[PDB]
Design an enzyme around this catalytic site. Structure first.
Site, PDB file in Angstrom:
ATOM      1  N   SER A  28     -10.995  -6.291   9.224  1.00  0.00           N
ATOM      2  CA  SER A  28     -12.185  -5.682   8.661  1.00  0.00           C
ATOM      3  C   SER A  28     -12.921  -6.743   7.785  1.00  0.00           C
ATOM      4  O   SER A  28     -12.290  -7.535   7.078  1.00  0.00           O
ATOM      5  CB  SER A  28     -11.757  -4.458   7.861  1.00  0.00           C
ATOM      6  OG  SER A  28     -12.636  -4.215   6.788  1.00  0.00           O
ATOM      7  N   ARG A  68       1.288   0.735  10.424  1.00  0.00           N
ATOM      8  CA  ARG A  68       0.869   1.287   9.148  1.00  0.00           C
ATOM      9  C   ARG A  68       2.132   1.340   8.294  1.00  0.00           C
ATOM     10  O   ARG A  68       2.894   2.290   8.369  1.00  0.00           O
ATOM     11  CB  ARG A  68       0.264   2.688   9.306  1.00  0.00           C
ATOM     12  CG  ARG A  68      -0.342   3.222   8.005  1.00  0.00           C
ATOM     13  CD  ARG A  68      -1.002   4.600   8.146  1.00  0.00           C
ATOM     14  NE  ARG A  68      -2.349   4.528   8.714  1.00  0.00           N
ATOM     15  CZ  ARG A  68      -2.657   4.853   9.968  1.00  0.00           C
ATOM     16  NH1 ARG A  68      -1.718   5.283  10.800  1.00  0.00           N
ATOM     17  NH2 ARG A  68      -3.907   4.742  10.398  1.00  0.00           N
ATOM     18  N   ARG A 114      -0.449  -6.128  12.295  1.00  0.00           N
ATOM     19  CA  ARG A 114      -1.202  -5.675  13.452  1.00  0.00           C
ATOM     20  C   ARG A 114      -1.478  -6.730  14.491  1.00  0.00           C
ATOM     21  O   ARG A 114      -1.682  -6.399  15.661  1.00  0.00           O
ATOM     22  CB  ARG A 114      -2.486  -4.984  13.012  1.00  0.00           C
ATOM     23  CG  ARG A 114      -2.143  -3.695  12.314  1.00  0.00           C
ATOM     24  CD  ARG A 114      -3.300  -2.783  12.103  1.00  0.00           C
ATOM     25  NE  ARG A 114      -2.889  -1.663  11.271  1.00  0.00           N
ATOM     26  CZ  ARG A 114      -3.729  -0.776  10.759  1.00  0.00           C
ATOM     27  NH1 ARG A 114      -5.031  -0.885  10.998  1.00  0.00           N
ATOM     28  NH2 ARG A 114      -3.267   0.217  10.009  1.00  0.00           N
ATOM     29  N   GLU A 174      -8.006  -0.821  14.699  1.00  0.00           N
ATOM     30  CA  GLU A 174      -8.463  -1.761  13.684  1.00  0.00           C
ATOM     31  C   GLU A 174      -7.418  -2.847  13.460  1.00  0.00           C
ATOM     32  O   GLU A 174      -6.242  -2.567  13.253  1.00  0.00           O
ATOM     33  CB  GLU A 174      -8.715  -1.060  12.357  1.00  0.00           C
ATOM     34  CG  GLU A 174      -8.937  -2.032  11.181  1.00  0.00           C
ATOM     35  CD  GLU A 174      -9.224  -1.327   9.860  1.00  0.00           C
ATOM     36  OE1 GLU A 174      -9.119  -1.984   8.806  1.00  0.00           O
ATOM     37  OE2 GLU A 174      -9.567  -0.124   9.866  1.00  0.00           O
ATOM     38  N   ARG A 179       0.819  -1.209   0.000  1.00  0.00           N
ATOM     39  CA  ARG A 179       0.000   0.000   0.000  1.00  0.00           C
ATOM     40  C   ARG A 179       0.869   1.283   0.000  1.00  0.00           C
ATOM     41  O   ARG A 179       1.930   1.358   0.642  1.00  0.00           O
ATOM     42  CB  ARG A 179      -0.941   0.028   1.221  1.00  0.00           C
ATOM     43  CG  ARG A 179      -1.354  -1.321   1.790  1.00  0.00           C
ATOM     44  CD  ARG A 179      -2.697  -1.860   1.304  1.00  0.00           C
ATOM     45  NE  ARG A 179      -3.802  -1.603   2.227  1.00  0.00           N
ATOM     46  CZ  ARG A 179      -4.842  -2.422   2.435  1.00  0.00           C
ATOM     47  NH1 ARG A 179      -4.945  -3.584   1.806  1.00  0.00           N
ATOM     48  NH2 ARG A 179      -5.829  -2.056   3.241  1.00  0.00           N
TER      49      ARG A 179
HETATM   50  N1  LIG Z   1      -0.744  -0.095   5.481  1.00  0.00           N
HETATM   51  C1  LIG Z   1      -0.943  -1.093   6.355  1.00  0.00           C
HETATM   52  N2  LIG Z   1       0.089  -1.469   7.164  1.00  0.00           N
HETATM   53  C2  LIG Z   1      -0.096  -2.503   8.005  1.00  0.00           C
HETATM   54  N3  LIG Z   1      -1.189  -3.262   8.183  1.00  0.00           N
HETATM   55  C3  LIG Z   1      -2.190  -2.860   7.378  1.00  0.00           C
HETATM   56  C4  LIG Z   1      -2.160  -1.816   6.460  1.00  0.00           C
HETATM   57  N4  LIG Z   1      -3.400  -1.666   5.843  1.00  0.00           N
HETATM   58  C5  LIG Z   1      -4.140  -2.602   6.390  1.00  0.00           C
HETATM   59  N5  LIG Z   1      -3.465  -3.367   7.324  1.00  0.00           N
HETATM   60  C6  LIG Z   1      -3.950  -4.511   8.083  1.00  0.00           C
HETATM   61  O1  LIG Z   1      -4.756  -5.269   7.188  1.00  0.00           O
HETATM   62  C7  LIG Z   1      -6.132  -5.255   7.654  1.00  0.00           C
HETATM   63  C8  LIG Z   1      -7.120  -5.328   6.516  1.00  0.00           C
HETATM   64  O2  LIG Z   1      -7.035  -4.196   5.645  1.00  0.00           O
HETATM   65  S1  LIG Z   1      -8.343  -3.450   5.180  1.00  0.00           S
HETATM   66  O3  LIG Z   1      -8.058  -2.513   4.103  1.00  0.00           O
HETATM   67  O4  LIG Z   1      -9.077  -3.000   6.353  1.00  0.00           O
HETATM   68  N6  LIG Z   1      -9.287  -4.591   4.547  1.00  0.00           N
HETATM   69  C9  LIG Z   1      -8.862  -5.392   3.548  1.00  0.00           C
HETATM   70  O5  LIG Z   1      -7.766  -5.246   3.003  1.00  0.00           O
HETATM   71  C10 LIG Z   1      -9.832  -6.483   3.093  1.00  0.00           C
HETATM   72  N7  LIG Z   1      -9.374  -7.247   1.917  1.00  0.00           N
HETATM   73  C11 LIG Z   1     -10.002  -7.402   4.256  1.00  0.00           C
HETATM   74  O6  LIG Z   1      -8.737  -7.917   4.661  1.00  0.00           O
HETATM   75  C12 LIG Z   1      -6.204  -4.044   8.565  1.00  0.00           C
HETATM   76  O7  LIG Z   1      -7.252  -4.240   9.491  1.00  0.00           O
HETATM   77  C13 LIG Z   1      -4.857  -4.141   9.265  1.00  0.00           C
HETATM   78  O8  LIG Z   1      -4.812  -5.121  10.288  1.00  0.00           O
END
Ligand SMILES: Nc1ncnc2c1ncn2[C@@H]1O[C@H](COS(=O)(=O)NC(=O)[C@@H](N)CO)[C@@H](O)[C@H]1O
Ligand SMILES: Nc1ncnc2c1ncn2[C@@H]1O[C@H](COS(=O)(=O)NC(=O)[C@@H](N)CO)[C@@H](O)[C@H]1O
Lengths: 447, 447
Positions: B373, B298, B412, B370, B283
């Site tokens: 999700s 993050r 996380r 969070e 991301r």
């Molecule tokens: N940039 C990030 N860095 C670290 N962990 C992350 C990041 N973005 C998301 N996560 C982890 O990944 C989880 C799911 O990401 S989310 O966008 O909420 N949802 C999804 O991607 C959906 N496909 C369900 O997994 C978050 O709750 C968190 O635990």
């Protein structure tokens, strides 16, 4: 990167190696860097000559301040010395620039032990292990490749290719991967996913027992760590760059593992630094696009547990020898017959001084295929990434030696396991050593 | 993508949902696409009118071949007809492009049970679990966010932040990662590496037991699969594109998992399709660069085990409820106290019709964050990727519904384990359910 000293103290050595390597269009560079180096040092001696004159003209202007002092001229000569000094300085920079350009684009000098050759057909087998299961129809090829130096059992039925086994085993979906991403990508399914993870943990565990600190590196790195790790040709053939960023997808944990200590003077009391990384790997595989094996033998992404070593130059060759044995042990536990090869000058590649490959016997293909590579990189990466060490805070930091070797690249380990442990019906038995990691002991065809 | 039949028969329904979502800007689009779709539908009518006329006009021009044939006037209309049909056709294609532009940028219709709200603060807690360890200095925010419906216990010592624990435990190196890749990247080390893989295996085994097919997808996909899984906004804010290639780094296994059956008419008999994917995730995290938590909370790169479901519309809501509980279960065995929240319209996102988040209590941070999700995307992704099903080869295929939910995102889950299971001296006890995977029962400080 080659040490300028080495080309100055033995240009013929470097020219002849270039020829043993098949890099003839680059032999003409040894002389080029030499005439440049010479020009470089000449201008520098000029600069000192001028710095000295600056001093003389100075004491001279003042010596007149007590006398008549018609200085005016001396002040103008003074003005030309600084003007000149600057020019020489900038001329010396440009010169260093042209010199380094070549230095970074010259392959590591090969070790005396690496056999001379044109390509993969000149690689030399030096060791064999295991009892190969050969199809009656591959008997001659097998015997020529094994040099009769390897035990083997003849198989009645014809052993299948790993691709076909993934199908009968319900372990992959290629067609949907091609739709989603393009050729040479894949979705891996069911027990094969567990097998992949299992192979990572197994490799990981064993290297850890041998003292390697496990690491999960960044999967995207900055351009300098990529140019600090391989030859620039790789940017065109293997490495993917991400749009609008100074980020590159790593082709092996090796690269981020080497950049890890870029620009450091290590404390010799710590050497050797032993790392075992895990990471997915991304490669363009541009040179190819449709060669032959159609499953997970040569793809764009695969998982690999990697061995990486930082040692004292005086310890590297011994390390080289240990990492290849570390990989050999894994495949022996995995019960995979193989032969290790000493790669020749022409099939060696820019980074390594010497390289050993483990080519597993692939019952279905009827041939030995590369499954791991162990390289002693000498100081080639160290000189690029500026990785030195000092034993006494006293002084004189020296470049370290770096080494790397596959522990297990799951992609090809999976093919080796499917092809070497298959039964007539397609059932694939999994090596006992992995049972603690997988759960299941075999994978049966679906119906 | 929203169904145009839906906006034609119930425009108030969609503009009301847009207003619920606080998207006053695009409420205007409903009227706009309605008017564009009217012109489109009419010109289409015109096209056939003219076509049929052109034939009936060429049959009477020949009927004059046997008569006086003063067809000059006729020959002229037949030419006006084709010229007309031609411009209409282009007008139509232009019209289809404008409406699609909107159809593809419109959020999913929310389920009446999704609370109206503007941002994270308006998200509603609907369930809590576990006994939180709360630092005395965090008592207020803890009761605030727990509603005082959660069992707890006051700690007199200040529990640490996961970033510091990672330091004392020797499980990460951030400085070197910044050197080699940039900020918000890292190197994971020693036991943290093992814990990471152990979490992936733990999540997989659990979902496999529940009947999910395990899959390792492509980590790079074509633009169409990304456009099929989220809002276009994500190309700017989250998704990395690879240079000179129709390839994109996946931000979650959810995308390739949805792309997997693009353009298919599934056999209803096979529904539901249950997949549990594993994969690294990438991301951009553009809206930030420096916000607050500075470890692996993050980051640009993380590992996640994803739940994906293809189901009949009549089963999607019951599955939404089952996958969130699947995730809760993992966190309960992991002994992580938490609360689950029903996401309000303002923090909902474009592809979900409803979403639940699990927010793990974080002792060091002094708050719920969070960690997972779960969503029901209804037919939004299915309409974009053209995923339909049919029970009888006879019937009109209809769109499936899709759902996704985190099983465990290791990043996380790791901060949650470090912060909820740290002791005063800095050691972290890893939960029992993970012992079979990690080998070690806890992680003690280094010096
Ligand atoms: N940039 C990030 N860095 C670290 N962990 C992350 C990041 N973005 C998301 N996560 C982890 O990944 C989880 C799911 O990401 S989310 O966008 O909420 N949802 C999804 O991607 C959906 N496909 C369900 O997994 C978050 O709750 C968190 O635990
Ligand atoms: N395109 C590919 N697809 C699948 N596996 C590959 C691919 N490229 C390499 N491998 C596997 O990874 C191994 C190591 O790759 S290598 O380039 O030979 N050497 C390295 O990467 C070194 N860092 C040592 O591991 C290969 O021997 C093979 O087992």
């Amino acid at each position: 990167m080659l040490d300028i000293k080495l080309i100055r103290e033995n240009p013929e050595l470097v020219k002849n190696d270039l020829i043993k390597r098949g890099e003839l269009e680059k032999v003409k560079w040894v002389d080029e860097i030499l005439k440049l180096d010479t020009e470089w040092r000449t201008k520098l001696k000029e600069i000192n000559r001028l710095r000295h004159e600056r001093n003389k003209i100075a004491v001279e202007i003042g010596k007149r301040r007590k006398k008549g002092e018609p200085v005016d001229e001396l002040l103008a000569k003074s003005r030309e010395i600084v003007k000149r000094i600057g020019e020489l300085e900038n001329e010396v920079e440009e010169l260093k620039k042209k010199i380094d350009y070549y230095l970074w684009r010259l392959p590591n000098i090969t070790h005396p032990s690496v056999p001379v050759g044109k390509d993969e057909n000149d690689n030399v087998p030096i060791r064999f292990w295991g009892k190969a299961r050969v199809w009656k129809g591959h008997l001659e090829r097998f015997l020529e490749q094994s040099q009769g130096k390897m035990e083997y059992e003849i198989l009645e039925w014809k052993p299948k290719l790993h691709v076909d086994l993934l199908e009968i085993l319900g372990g992959a979906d290629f067609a949907r991967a091609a739709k989603v991403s393009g050729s040479r990508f894949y979705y891996l399914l069911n027990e094969i996913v567990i097998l992949d993870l299992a192979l990572i943990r197994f490799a990981l565990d064993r290297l850890i027992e041998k003292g390697f600190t496990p690491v999960i590196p960044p999967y995207m790195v900055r351009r300098f760590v990529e140019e600090g790790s391989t030859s620039f040709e790789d940017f065109e053939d293997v490495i993917y760059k991400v749009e609008d960023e100074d980020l590159y997808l790593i082709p092996t944990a090796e690269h981020p593992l080497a950049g890890m200590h870029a620009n450091e003077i290590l404390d010799g009391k710590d050497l050797p630094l032993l790392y075992v990384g895990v990471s997915p790997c991304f490669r363009k595989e541009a040179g190819t696009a449709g060669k032959d094996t159609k499953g997970i033998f040569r793809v764009h992404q695969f998982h690999k547990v990697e061995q990486f070593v930082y040692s004292r130059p005086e310890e590297s060759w011994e390390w080289h020898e240990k990492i290849i044995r570390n990989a050999e042990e894994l495949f022996q536990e995995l019960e995979i017959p193989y032969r290790v090869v000493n790669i020749c000058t022409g099939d060696l590649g820019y980074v390594a001084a010497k390289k050993y490959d483990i080519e597993a016997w692939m019952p279905g293909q009827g041939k030995f295929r590369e499954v791991v590579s162990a390289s002693n990189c000498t100081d080639w990466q160290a000189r690029r990434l500026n990785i030195r060490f000092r034993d006494r805070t006293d002084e004189k930091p020296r470049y370290v030696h770096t080494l790397n070797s596959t522990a297990i690249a799951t992609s090809r380990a999976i093919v080796a396991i499917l092809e070497n442990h298959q039964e007539e019906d397609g059932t694939v038995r999994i090596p006992k050593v992995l049972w603690k990691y997988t759960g299941f002991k075999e994978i049966v065809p679906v119906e």
